[PDB]
Amino acid sequence: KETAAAKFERQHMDSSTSAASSSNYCNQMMKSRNLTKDRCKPVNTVVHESLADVQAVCSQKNVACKNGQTNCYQSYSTMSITDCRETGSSKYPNCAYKTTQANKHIIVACEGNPYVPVHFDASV
Question: Which residues form the active site?
Fold first, then answer.
């Protein structure tokens, strides 16, 4: 069973690039990170910063999570991210994604020791 921290890295981390590469970036990323294996993951945000920078967010601005929990943190600075979302013509096993690149603050839920990201709550 994949640890929560490891799942967050696989789903939300892509440092090897400063930003989404092409309108086809999401199709490629979603498939490679195995988010289209048995079904197309509807929505998924990927952060284009170092793992260290993302993990550091857990010590930054403490904000409420969408679900009411209080273990969410908002990055002080904006970060390069790509939102991947299924399009209308998307249909398993032929998943299709719209790639939207942006630079904003990320909000992640953190837990454990070390205290690291385990959920991507949203971006602002």
Answer: 12, 119
